[PDB]
Design an enzyme around this catalytic site. Structure first.
Site, PDB file in Angstrom:
ATOM      1  N   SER A   1       0.851  -1.178   0.000  1.00 14.96           N
ATOM      2  CA  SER A   1       0.000   0.000   0.000  1.00 14.96           C
ATOM      3  C   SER A   1       0.882   1.221   0.000  1.00 14.96           C
ATOM      4  O   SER A   1       1.993   1.161   0.509  1.00 14.96           O
ATOM      5  CB  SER A   1      -0.888  -0.008   1.249  1.00 14.96           C
ATOM      6  OG  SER A   1      -1.623   1.203   1.388  1.00 14.96           O
TER       7      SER A   1
ATOM      8  N   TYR B   1      -1.093  -1.065  10.439  1.00  9.62           N
ATOM      9  CA  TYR B   1      -1.268  -1.341   8.999  1.00  9.62           C
ATOM     10  C   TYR B   1      -0.023  -0.910   8.207  1.00  9.62           C
ATOM     11  O   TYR B   1       0.645  -1.744   7.588  1.00  9.62           O
ATOM     12  CB  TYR B   1      -2.524  -0.641   8.460  1.00  9.62           C
ATOM     13  CG  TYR B   1      -2.808  -0.879   6.988  1.00  9.62           C
ATOM     14  CD1 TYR B   1      -3.374  -2.068   6.544  1.00  9.62           C
ATOM     15  CD2 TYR B   1      -2.534   0.100   6.047  1.00  9.62           C
ATOM     16  CE1 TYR B   1      -3.635  -2.280   5.191  1.00  9.62           C
ATOM     17  CE2 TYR B   1      -2.795  -0.092   4.705  1.00  9.62           C
ATOM     18  CZ  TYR B   1      -3.341  -1.276   4.275  1.00  9.62           C
ATOM     19  OH  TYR B   1      -3.600  -1.429   2.936  1.00  9.62           O
TER      20      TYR B   1
END
Lengths: 255, 245, 255, 245
Positions: free
Chosen positions: D136, D149
């Site tokens: 990401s 995350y």
């Protein structure tokens, strides 16, 4: 080897299309259904590229150090095929000298041909792309423009400037539908680099073994052409302002 | 850094002046080079402590050679170099002219290189030295309008790497400083073409940086505390590129 | 060697302060006028660091894999010196195994101690820094967290996670007056890495010559401590969310 | 890619499903692994052409080993791997709990590693292969809220480099794809905590990306056209980090 139907009937200008990566780019694009203008400093090589390729492709001579000649190239592409959808700025020179022995004359030439040249191609290509509703650009840089390689100062400085060219192109022309990305090959089997690899240190590998250690093997120009054609395609719709590293892992590790 | 000799280009104003004053506070002899001789003298005069002034146009290799020689004559040799001389130019990529591109490259990139080209042999004669090249966040992240500028600043980032590479064995270090938004005349003029300036600065960087804040990093980079820092791109952007702000 | 008067009377917690970079960081900070809490997994080493340093510095034991122990550390710093201004998360382990032979048990331990540990120090340090009006953090990562080094998979994965820790810390706490930056040393003369450099390939250099070729020479822990203390200082007021490369040039070139 | 065998984790929805369908369009046998068996079957059923379904919890090494074995049993061996399984978590750095951190790491980073750990020996048995790990932009640039995350996604970026390094001589390539904002259920749930979502997306990236757009990059990265691309971090962010937008 993958296909792209979105490239059929698209018009591409490839500079430095006479040899190596550019000839490889021109031939791959033709095989995807592109109309290709093969531009080169060497007029004969340009004609010969278009002759190898067929597919209605055309040639013209360009010294990318002259703005007028770049304008004449774009004009000729428009006159031959009706417009311009894709650009691959690949024209360039290599120069080898220590940072402290490099002359101003040599620096100027290398910046003019490599950096000023890639820019000027974008400056005169992009307006014509905007008329078509968008377009794609790939500039060829080199690993030497992001990592130091001894003896490549001027060259490396010019090639770094190209990496930023793509970012500023992406920034300024994204809302006009235009993408720009930089390809960073390391060690490729082409005449342009064969001059460079004459560099032989105090050890007998050092090119052969240098390249094996760092990259694993010599790269074929064809392997760079598949990357360029991907980046020009709609499968890269979300890719803009990036530095594509195609170095076989060279900078991913301590080798 | 007491007793060391430093050349600072563009010392007449902005980061260069803060860098010169700050090296002076550290006991360092400083040659203030600037394209404006009066600003050079004014800077050397403001600082006072041994600092010499020197007029340089970094587009001209010959004057760069004279500047290094002036510093040798004044102070014995050269230990430190801070290449801060530059110009800004604003124009879109497609409206930029060859003349403005050539001039921006000449001054910014070529000039920074030439300064290293001729200072370095003097650093070799001393057993080593340290270089800090001043670039810009605009040399790494595109700011619209700043094409030729950005391209030239990008090349400086690479100057420092190739310098560090070839000269490490001679005891020379080189790093780039990448400031973002700093309160200087060079920038204020630039930024005056206004997601516009005031709010972008607050949002990306937190506030405008002072030239002094940049100066203390330059000095750190020039010091033996930075002895294992070479070929790096130093980011002093208050977080700009660290986050999506 | 430079001075910083803005650090006199500041309170710093250094984890892994018993040996190497952390001991070097603790001693340099004390010499700048800091009150230092020397934390370490080895309680004796912690006591011994505080004993070497003097300057009213104190010790405590911390297993940074336990959250409660991290809480107890911060509590002890507050109770010894009144608050917390600076943090250097340096506690860590090295582990060596191919990516495909590394066990889950080993991965978990390395992530818990290195990554989860550095985070938890920031989680419990930062609130106390906010009360003081701001603060500074340095996490130690490694070149192996940005470039691959064979055999350091788990380790390298944890050290990459730390590099991002600093960014997210900078992002989330900048308006609270807190800075966070990552230091990436390559090859330093410390006991932690001496375990690592037992790695000997089919060639007799390969550590000694590997390190000379890439970095130029072995780094002294003291050389990393000057960088850490700079980054914690007000001369770094504009530095946050950065990766400080202190690798002597290792990744600047093809060596 | 006709005749090649691929494992795609999280194939039940989002990028994984687009990746599976897209590899199927390329003549590739595909094992659709997902923590939801019904989504796995539904995906394999939707695709149809030989694709098998498989239930996997990538937090459990044993199930990852069973998944690779299932693919060998179904299709003969393993040529390609796309590790897309993941979870999102939102909480500030100081409010994140050890339990949520552990679970996010377990699934995202550990899981992605374990998938390579066990798929790779099978790729060696075939003469080589190719891995694409899905990370990401949040693994490289801080987005507030995304601590655990982001930390886990950062580690994946490094997974690909160490994989490429150790396995290059075995003919295995590994790269990371870094999408920014893609229209998927995983994200839509995330992004629903709203410089807020709608306008940030338009401004940074131009528009929201489709999962299909990501899929075509994955496929490129898995193909022999990407034969000199390994250990790279592929940015598909529509320009986000290229400019100050």
């Amino acid at each position: 080897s993958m296909n792209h139907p979105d490239l059929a009937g698209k018009v591409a200008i490839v500079t430095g299309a006479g040899a190596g990566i550019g000839l490889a780019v021109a031939r791959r694009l033709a095989d995807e259904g592109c109309h290709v203008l093969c531009a080169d400093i060497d007029g004969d090589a340009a004609d010969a590229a278009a002759t190898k390729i067929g597919c209605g492709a055309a040639a013209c001579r360009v010294d990318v150090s002259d703005e007028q000649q770049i304008i004449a190239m774009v004009d000729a592409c428009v006159a031959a095929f009706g417009g311009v959808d894709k650009l691959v700025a690949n024209a360039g020179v290599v120069h080898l000298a220590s940072l402290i022995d490099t002359t101003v004359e040599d620096f100027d030439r290398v910046i003019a041909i490599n950096l000023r040249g890639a820019w000027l191609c974008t400056k005169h290509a992009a307006p014509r792309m905007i008329e078509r509703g968008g377009g794609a650009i790939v500039n060829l840089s080199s690993l030497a423009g992001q990592v130091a390689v001894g003896g490549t100062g001027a060259y490396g400085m010019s090639k770094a400037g190209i990496i930023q060219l793509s970012r500023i192109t992406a920034a300024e022309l994204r809302s006009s539908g235009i993408r720009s990305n930089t390809l960073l090959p390391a060690f490729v089997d082409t005449p342009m680099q064969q001059t460079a690899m004459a560099m032989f240190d105090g050890a007998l590998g050092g090119a052969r073994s240098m390249i094996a250690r760092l990259q694993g093997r010599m790269a074929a120009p064809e392997e760079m052409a598949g990357i360029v054609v991907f980046l020009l395609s709609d499968d890269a719709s979300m890719i803009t302002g990036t530095t594509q590293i195609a170095d076989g892992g060279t900078i991913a590790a301590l080798w």
